[PDB]
Description:
Elements: H1 29-36, E1 42-46, E2 53-57, E3 65-71, H2 75-85, E4 92-94, E5 101-107, E6 110-117, E7 120-126, H3 131-145
InterPro entries: DUF2020 (IPR018567), Mog1/PsbP_a/b/a-sand (IPR016123)
Protein name: DUF2020 domain-containing protein
Amino acid sequence: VHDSALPFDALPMPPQGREGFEECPYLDSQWVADTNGQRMTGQGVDTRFDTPACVFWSYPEAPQATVMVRHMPSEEEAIRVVDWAAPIDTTEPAEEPDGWSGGRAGHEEGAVYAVQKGPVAVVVWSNQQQSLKAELMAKEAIARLGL
């Protein structure tokens, strides 16, 4: 079983939240602050997922960025994750890095970038309006994890 058999719509929940210290194994904290654009208050990891989910906080209650890696039982289920995070009628295609597919959107409420490749899904949410920020983070996580 992968990712503790969590359902398609599971969200990261690092157990100590914003007062956590534990760094993301695949994204440098400084790089994320510079890319996303807000100073870091704290960060945590959610090891329910085979690849831990990483959450990054600045001063707001809601995180500045959330990065989630999903290993689903099938490609169908990885697509369900991607379509949930980035709905077909509200987002534009995301096709990077090569071999990945899904959607992306940047609005006043934040941004998302969600792609799958086979049964693996990678979703990044940002509190920023620029979907490019979420895209850079997704690409970087994918590169660092060798996915």
